[PDB]
Every structure is written in C-alpha cells, then in structure tokens.
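yo

u said u wanted the structure for the complex thing, so here. seqs first:
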Amino acid sequence: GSLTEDGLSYKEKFVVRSYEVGSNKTATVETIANLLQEVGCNHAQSVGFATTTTMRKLHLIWVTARMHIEIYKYPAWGDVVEIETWCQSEGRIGTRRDWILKDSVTGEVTGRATSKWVMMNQDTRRLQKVSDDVRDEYLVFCPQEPRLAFPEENNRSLKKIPKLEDPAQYSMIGLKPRRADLDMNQHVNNVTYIGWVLESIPQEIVDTHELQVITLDYRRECQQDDVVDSLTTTTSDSQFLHLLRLSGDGQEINRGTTLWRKK
Amino acid sequence: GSLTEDGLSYKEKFVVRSYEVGSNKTATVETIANLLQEVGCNHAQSVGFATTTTMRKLHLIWVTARMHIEIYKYPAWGDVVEIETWCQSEGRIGTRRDWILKDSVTGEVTGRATSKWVMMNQDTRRLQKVSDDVRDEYLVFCPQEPRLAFPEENNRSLKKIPKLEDPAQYSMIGLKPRRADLDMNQHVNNVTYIGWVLESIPQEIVDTHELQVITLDYRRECQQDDVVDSLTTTTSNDSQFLHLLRLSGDGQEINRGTTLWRKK
Ligand SMILES: N#Cc1ccccc1O
Ligand SMILES: N#Cc1ccccc1O
Ligand SMILES: N#Cc1ccccc1O
Ligand SMILES: N#Cc1ccccc1O
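structre next:
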C-alpha cells in the first residue's frame, strides 16, 4: 500500500482469500469491513500514528459511531480489489473516514463506504468532543475541500435509524464473542457486530439475495462476558430494521438497516 | 505465490494484518492456521485442481484427520512471513500436507506444520483407502523421496491422544458457529475448531505463556445447528494440556488434542 501523490489519501490492493468468501465464492461483507479497517490502519501508520501524542497524553481515543457500506459487486475469490481511503474533519463533532473500492482489472467502482468517528476518554468512556489543539494536528493529513464517498444531499448514509419494537420478526439469541473476535487491545472487533446483525437474517434471504447496503450505529460496546441477542424485522428489494441488545437487561449496543437485491 | 523451480512445492508471502494479531501484536495461531489453508488452496489451484476429475465423478473429497503446528516465533503485525508447502502420499492410508514458515527478512524457520488427510465419500461420509487410479493422478505433483517437516524419531506430530475424562479442570460451554465460521461449502472451517479448543485455556495462561505446539484430531463435524463444549485439563517452565470438544447434548466427540505452552 501507499499514500497517493498529494499525500492526502491512501491506496492498497488485496487478493481475496479462500476462507474470505461465502457460498457464491465472492468476499463476504465482513471480509470487506475487515479490509476497510486494514487500509485505515495502514493509512494511519504511513503518516506517523490513530491517536496523536497529545491524545495519548490525555487518554483520548477515536471510536466508531456509525459505519455505512454500499457494494455493487463483491470481488470473487482470487480477484484483486483496490481500496482508496481518506479522512476529513467535520468540526468539533468528529471525523469521517471514507473508502472507495475498485476492481483492479477494469478500474470500475465496485463499492463505497463512510464512517463517523468521535473522541472519547479511554477510561471514563465520556465523549467531550474534538478540541482545538488536537484538531490542528490532524488537519495537515486531510483534504481541505470536501471529498465525499456519498455526496448526494440527504443520502442513505445520513438517515436516522429507529429503534426496533418487540416482538421482532426474526431473532438469533445468546451470541457470545470468542478470542478470535477480539482486537489487540482485547476489545470486540467492530466487524463482529456486523456479523451479529446478519445472524438474524433468514437463510432464504441470504440464498436468494445479495446484500447491497448496510448502515450500523454503535452505541455501547459488548464486553468479553456479555451475551447478545440479534433482532430483525422486515420493513419493505428487501429492507430490514436491526437491533443488537445485551441478553439480560436488554441494553442497546447497536441499531442498523440492510437493503438486499434479488440475485 | 508460486510453484518452486521443480514444481513439487509452493511458496507464498503474507503481510500480517492489524486484525490478525493478539495482545502481543503478533499473529494468532488461528491466523497462522488460516494462512496454511490459504497457501494449500493456492498450491492446489496452481496445478489444476483439491479433487481430481475422477474424485468429483465418484463424489469423493479430501478431509482433515489431524493438524499439528509448532511455532518458534509468531510474526509481528506488518511483518512478512514466507510459507512453503508440499504434499506426499502415505500409501493407501491417505496423504500428508506439510508447511514451513520463515521470516522473510532473516530467512530463519519460525514454524512448521503437518496434516493428515483421508478420502471420504461426500454424501455417505464413509472413509476409504485411496485407490490406485486416483492415487496415480496425484503422484506427479508430489516429491517421491520422503520430505518431512517433522523428521524426528518419535516426534510430537505422530503421538496418540487420549480421551479426557470428566470432570474436566476447565470448560467453555455452549459454543456455536456463526456465518463467518463457515467455508464456501457452508461447512464449519477447520480453523474454528482450533479456536474452540483454545476457548477453555485460562486467560492467566494466555497472558503469561506463548503457545508452542498444538496437535488436533478431527473425528466428526460440528453442523450449523450443533452446540459445542470445550474441555481442558492440565497434564503437566512449560505447561501441557489435554483437550476435548464434544457436542453439548449427548456428548458425542468431535475433536481431541493437546497444547504445549512456554512461559513468556
Ligand atoms: N483524522 C485523521 C487521519 C488522517 C489521516 C490518517 C489518519 C488519520 O487518523
Ligand atoms: N471474547 C472473549 C473471551 C476472552 C477470554 C476467554 C474466552 C473468551 O471467549
Ligand atoms: N496429494 C496432493 C496434492 C499435491 C499437490 C497439490 C495439490 C494436491 O492435492
Ligand atoms: N453456522 C451457522 C449459521 C448458519 C445460518 C444462519 C446462522 C448461523 O449462525
């Protein structure tokens, strides 16, 4: 991978692996989400990091608030997918990281994604919002003119998501993380939550449709000893409303929506 | 990746990813097992496949009976690991696939692995000794002189594993696969079973030790609707454990194994 000519975005190519594909022999949306995370980390490394020494001193970290992914064509097993990523500050609110996925052979855009990140104290888990001196440190690595993977005014990535009301149409109960679901800091990987959302989609949908769009809000983290229930109701192409909540008290951890196109 | 000069082994390099590492910022044993599977798959593709046209006609597949991995140094996040793999027939019993892992910078061997595979009818699940006509088709892609990743006299890779007796010292109950644990044929990925074995190792061991050796026997498959219990008992500067995976209800065995850990 490498920073582009202007040093304001980063590109990396990936060969889709045999264990990374589903039954149609194309990459799963979780493999795609793992690759977006990987190119995001390689971008942060290439420019000196994604916390600055200032954030590290204040015990401040970046945390995902929302992930939105739209795929037109999933890369097949053995195909090379090229991914370009960049960041942009959105004022005191937080920062956005965008991605563009392309077929390396044709050069056509096969997917796009956008995420919203907020600053949080690592210990108290309190938000606080982006400070003046911290922001300045990041500004030099972001384009100043708006560069959006989803430019359209009031598009799918910015839509408010409602809370699913019981009884849910479908559910997968008692989902628990294992060591492979944790990251290097022993926290559940953000991609695991996407997998848990998808657990309550009926197999008949998975067999006859392809996932086109997924939007997922992150409200609270699932700890190593937590148990999750994944709820799904049809709201319609097929569209679904999703809710992840901790098995006991029913505390919400995530809410989202999915849009599926008939194969 | 590419077949070597003699066309009898295959090499591929991998850059360790950020989500592939544990708390030490080095690759997990499950990341390593996934990479061995990937280089095995790329080797089969580079030579025409890992079923031959005759096996597909007969509804015959290769299935793993045993996996044995020994790691000296786990590659760090960002490091390039080079893996060489080859196959050898072991008569009518079945075939063996071996791997050698190396640090791409130093050229030193950082790990090695060996696996035993048997032929099985895909539908009846019945095992069979490898026939001559099928065997002959594979022989041209394997070295004829023995090439072993574990040459040693009574090496760890060939040791018989006993059945853990209740009560187990440690256990992780109610483990279930999710869609990410399945392969392209909707079967639980062989690496998931390694993860499930490791689930019952106490966190204190994981924090103070590094996994050196894991040997795992595969007896039966966990289906999509099955639930698994992972049992572990200490059998021992080094810690050794006996492992058992069994289906949560009736207690039917799916896997047995052993692990050896060295103090960090
Ligand atoms: N904000 C921000 C940012 C920009 C370039 C690379 C890494 C980052 O976290
Ligand atoms: N997640 C998780 C986890 C952590 C330590 C032991 C077992 C687990 O499933
Ligand atoms: N047996 C065997 C074998 C050898 C080279 C590549 C793939 C194989 O299944
Ligand atoms: N394993 C598995 C699985 C298959 C279909 C739906 C949900 C699942 O966890």
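Residues A 43-44, 47, 49-50, 87, 95, 138, 141-142 surround 2-hydroxybenzonitrile (ligand 1) (CB under 6 Å). Residues 187 and 223 of chain A are 7 Å apart (CA to CA).
cya
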